[PDB]
Design an enzyme around this catalytic site. Structure first.
Site, PDB file in Angstrom:
ATOM      1  N   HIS A 184       0.805  -1.253   0.000  1.00  0.00           N
ATOM      2  CA  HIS A 184       0.000   0.000   0.000  1.00  0.00           C
ATOM      3  C   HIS A 184       0.827   1.288   0.000  1.00  0.00           C
ATOM      4  O   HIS A 184       0.299   2.356  -0.289  1.00  0.00           O
ATOM      5  CB  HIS A 184      -0.888   0.047   1.254  1.00  0.00           C
ATOM      6  CG  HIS A 184      -1.765  -1.145   1.401  1.00  0.00           C
ATOM      7  ND1 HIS A 184      -2.605  -1.570   0.390  1.00  0.00           N
ATOM      8  CD2 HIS A 184      -1.933  -2.015   2.426  1.00  0.00           C
ATOM      9  CE1 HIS A 184      -3.249  -2.656   0.781  1.00  0.00           C
ATOM     10  NE2 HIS A 184      -2.875  -2.936   2.020  1.00  0.00           N
ATOM     11  N   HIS A 213       5.582   7.243   5.909  1.00  0.00           N
ATOM     12  CA  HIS A 213       5.330   6.621   4.624  1.00  0.00           C
ATOM     13  C   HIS A 213       4.841   7.677   3.648  1.00  0.00           C
ATOM     14  O   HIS A 213       4.617   8.860   4.013  1.00  0.00           O
ATOM     15  CB  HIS A 213       4.272   5.504   4.789  1.00  0.00           C
ATOM     16  CG  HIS A 213       2.985   6.010   5.339  1.00  0.00           C
ATOM     17  ND1 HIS A 213       2.781   6.174   6.690  1.00  0.00           N
ATOM     18  CD2 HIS A 213       1.887   6.504   4.731  1.00  0.00           C
ATOM     19  CE1 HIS A 213       1.588   6.699   6.895  1.00  0.00           C
ATOM     20  NE2 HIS A 213       1.026   6.909   5.720  1.00  0.00           N
ATOM     21  N   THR A 215      -6.303   7.347   7.140  1.00  0.00           N
ATOM     22  CA  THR A 215      -6.745   7.373   5.738  1.00  0.00           C
ATOM     23  C   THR A 215      -6.806   5.995   5.094  1.00  0.00           C
ATOM     24  O   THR A 215      -7.123   5.887   3.904  1.00  0.00           O
ATOM     25  CB  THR A 215      -5.861   8.275   4.861  1.00  0.00           C
ATOM     26  OG1 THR A 215      -4.581   7.669   4.666  1.00  0.00           O
ATOM     27  CG2 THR A 215      -5.719   9.687   5.479  1.00  0.00           C
ATOM     28  N   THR A 216      -6.487   4.964   5.862  1.00  0.00           N
ATOM     29  CA  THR A 216      -6.713   3.584   5.450  1.00  0.00           C
ATOM     30  C   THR A 216      -7.359   2.873   6.620  1.00  0.00           C
ATOM     31  O   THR A 216      -7.321   3.396   7.744  1.00  0.00           O
ATOM     32  CB  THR A 216      -5.412   2.836   5.099  1.00  0.00           C
ATOM     33  OG1 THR A 216      -4.678   2.551   6.290  1.00  0.00           O
ATOM     34  CG2 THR A 216      -4.557   3.635   4.132  1.00  0.00           C
ATOM     35  N   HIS A 271       3.601  11.340   5.204  1.00  0.00           N
ATOM     36  CA  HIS A 271       2.990  11.262   6.524  1.00  0.00           C
ATOM     37  C   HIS A 271       3.939  10.732   7.576  1.00  0.00           C
ATOM     38  O   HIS A 271       4.535   9.662   7.378  1.00  0.00           O
ATOM     39  CB  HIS A 271       1.771  10.357   6.466  1.00  0.00           C
ATOM     40  CG  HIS A 271       0.659  10.933   5.661  1.00  0.00           C
ATOM     41  ND1 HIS A 271      -0.376  10.174   5.181  1.00  0.00           N
ATOM     42  CD2 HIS A 271       0.431  12.194   5.229  1.00  0.00           C
ATOM     43  CE1 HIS A 271      -1.197  10.932   4.493  1.00  0.00           C
ATOM     44  NE2 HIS A 271      -0.736  12.166   4.518  1.00  0.00           N
ATOM     45  N   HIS A 318       2.432   8.725  -0.102  1.00  0.00           N
ATOM     46  CA  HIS A 318       1.329   8.532  -1.017  1.00  0.00           C
ATOM     47  C   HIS A 318       1.670   9.292  -2.285  1.00  0.00           C
ATOM     48  O   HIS A 318       2.165  10.427  -2.219  1.00  0.00           O
ATOM     49  CB  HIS A 318       0.032   9.075  -0.426  1.00  0.00           C
ATOM     50  CG  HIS A 318      -0.349   8.445   0.867  1.00  0.00           C
ATOM     51  ND1 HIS A 318      -1.177   7.348   0.946  1.00  0.00           N
ATOM     52  CD2 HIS A 318      -0.023   8.761   2.141  1.00  0.00           C
ATOM     53  CE1 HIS A 318      -1.353   7.023   2.212  1.00  0.00           C
ATOM     54  NE2 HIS A 318      -0.660   7.864   2.954  1.00  0.00           N
TER      55      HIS A 318
HETATM   56  C1  LIG Z   1      -3.540  -3.132  16.139  1.00  0.00           C
HETATM   57  O1  LIG Z   1      -2.246  -2.526  15.938  1.00  0.00           O
HETATM   58  C2  LIG Z   1      -2.032  -1.487  15.055  1.00  0.00           C
HETATM   59  C3  LIG Z   1      -0.729  -1.061  14.777  1.00  0.00           C
HETATM   60  C4  LIG Z   1      -0.510  -0.015  13.873  1.00  0.00           C
HETATM   61  C5  LIG Z   1      -1.560   0.637  13.199  1.00  0.00           C
HETATM   62  N1  LIG Z   1      -1.369   1.669  12.356  1.00  0.00           N
HETATM   63  C6  LIG Z   1      -2.172   2.046  11.343  1.00  0.00           C
HETATM   64  C7  LIG Z   1      -1.509   3.145  10.862  1.00  0.00           C
HETATM   65  C8  LIG Z   1      -1.978   4.027   9.752  1.00  0.00           C
HETATM   66  C9  LIG Z   1      -2.967   3.786   8.789  1.00  0.00           C
HETATM   67  C10 LIG Z   1      -3.137   4.908   7.947  1.00  0.00           C
HETATM   68  C11 LIG Z   1      -2.271   5.964   8.297  1.00  0.00           C
HETATM   69  S1  LIG Z   1      -2.227   7.462   7.576  1.00  0.00           S
HETATM   70  N2  LIG Z   1      -2.280   7.294   5.990  1.00  0.00           N
HETATM   71  O2  LIG Z   1      -1.114   8.241   8.026  1.00  0.00           O
HETATM   72  O3  LIG Z   1      -3.463   8.092   7.999  1.00  0.00           O
HETATM   73  S2  LIG Z   1      -1.262   5.577   9.623  1.00  0.00           S
HETATM   74  N3  LIG Z   1      -0.411   3.487  11.571  1.00  0.00           N
HETATM   75  N4  LIG Z   1      -0.288   2.522  12.570  1.00  0.00           N
HETATM   76  C12 LIG Z   1      -2.842   0.178  13.510  1.00  0.00           C
HETATM   77  C13 LIG Z   1      -3.084  -0.854  14.401  1.00  0.00           C
HETATM   78 ZN   LIG Z   2      -0.675   8.049   5.074  1.00  0.00          ZN
END
Ligand SMILES: COc1ccc(-n2cc(-c3ccc(S(N)(=O)=O)s3)nn2)cc1
Ligand SMILES: [Zn+2]
Length: 251
Positions: free
Chosen positions: A60, A86, A192-193, A111, A88
């Site tokens: 991703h 990361h 955002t994901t 980000h 995008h």
């Molecule tokens: C259950 O343990 C977890 C460990 C890490 C995550 N995790 C998701 C994310 C993100 C998903 C999307 C973003 S974003 N694109 O910066 O909004 S950051 N960062 N850490 C989520 C759950």
């Molecule tokens: Zn992001």
């Protein structure tokens, strides 16, 4: 989950159908000047070369895992620790930033994801107010090779395949962000994901980061995602503000 197709994100995580999601279209004329918003403060972002950092094609994005000790503050008493960063991006001649400004989409976006010091783990912070904070900057084309970005971009060939990773020497992580930490937008939104958890504090810098054309092409042309498909256009569709007011640190 994937971009551009099934499964539907709310089936993966109902939070993806929340009213207060990210990313958003920033309309600077509708932003509220809030003088309480002071310059962002970072400490420990200039890393030694060892220990090395993990750099991963997760299908991703390309994600750099950050070590302990990177401290960030949104202001007095609003203290965070950096977890990872990361990117995008779009495709040849198509922009792929997540945030937009007056409908303008930028070539790419960085980000840097942080965890509130009030929480030991990300999963405890998900969905909690201000539990997570993301620093976001747009990436545009400039005339020069950006040497901080080059440290990561020169290693994408090693991780072209979905699910691959490599180790990179520590670098100045703050050099991946704009020089101006004073002028920014800030609002409350979501990941955002999936899991799309709300309560995330978003800070979007006014100043953009400049990469060379070659660098931007390397970012969008090197990595492969799910299926036999190129990892491109890895951004979520714009989400409505739905009555949220974006704040600005400048009038
Ligand atoms: C259950 O343990 C977890 C460990 C890490 C995550 N995790 C998701 C994310 C993100 C998903 C999307 C973003 S974003 N694109 O910066 O909004 S950051 N960062 N850490 C989520 C759950
Ligand atoms: Zn992001």
């Amino acid at each position: 989950w994937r971009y551009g197709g099934d499964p539907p994100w709310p089936r993966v995580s109902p939070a993806c159908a929340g009213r207060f999601q990210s990313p958003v279209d920033i309309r600077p004329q509708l932003a509220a000047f809030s003088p309480a918003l002071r310059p962002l403060e970072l400490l420990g972002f200039q890393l030694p070369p060892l220990p090395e950092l993990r750099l991963r094609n997760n299908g991703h994005s390309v994600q750099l895992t950050l070590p302990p000790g990177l401290e960030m503050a949104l202001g007095p008493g609003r203290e965070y620790r950096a977890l990872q960063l990361h990117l995008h991006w779009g495709a040849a001649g198509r922009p792929g930033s997540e945030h937009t400004v007056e409908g303008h989409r930028f070539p790419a976006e960085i980000h840097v994801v942080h965890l509130s010091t009030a929480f030991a783990r990300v999963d405890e912070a998900l969905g909690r107010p201000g539990g997570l904070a993301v620093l976001a900057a747009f990436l545009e084309e400039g005339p020069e090779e950006n040497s901080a970005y080059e440290q990561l971009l020169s290693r994408l060939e090693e991780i072209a395949e979905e699910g691959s990773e490599t180790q990179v020497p520590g670098l100045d992580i703050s050099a991946l962000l704009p020089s101006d930490f004073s002028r920014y937008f800030q609002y409350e939104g979501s990941l955002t994901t999936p899991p799309c958890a709300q309560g995330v504090i978003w800070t979007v810098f006014n100043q953009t980061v400049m990469l060379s054309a070659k660098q931007l092409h390397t970012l969008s042309d090197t990595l492969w995602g799910p299926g036999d498909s190129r990892l491109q256009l890895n951004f979520r569709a714009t989400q409505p503000l739905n009555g949220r007011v974006i704040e600005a640190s400048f009038p």
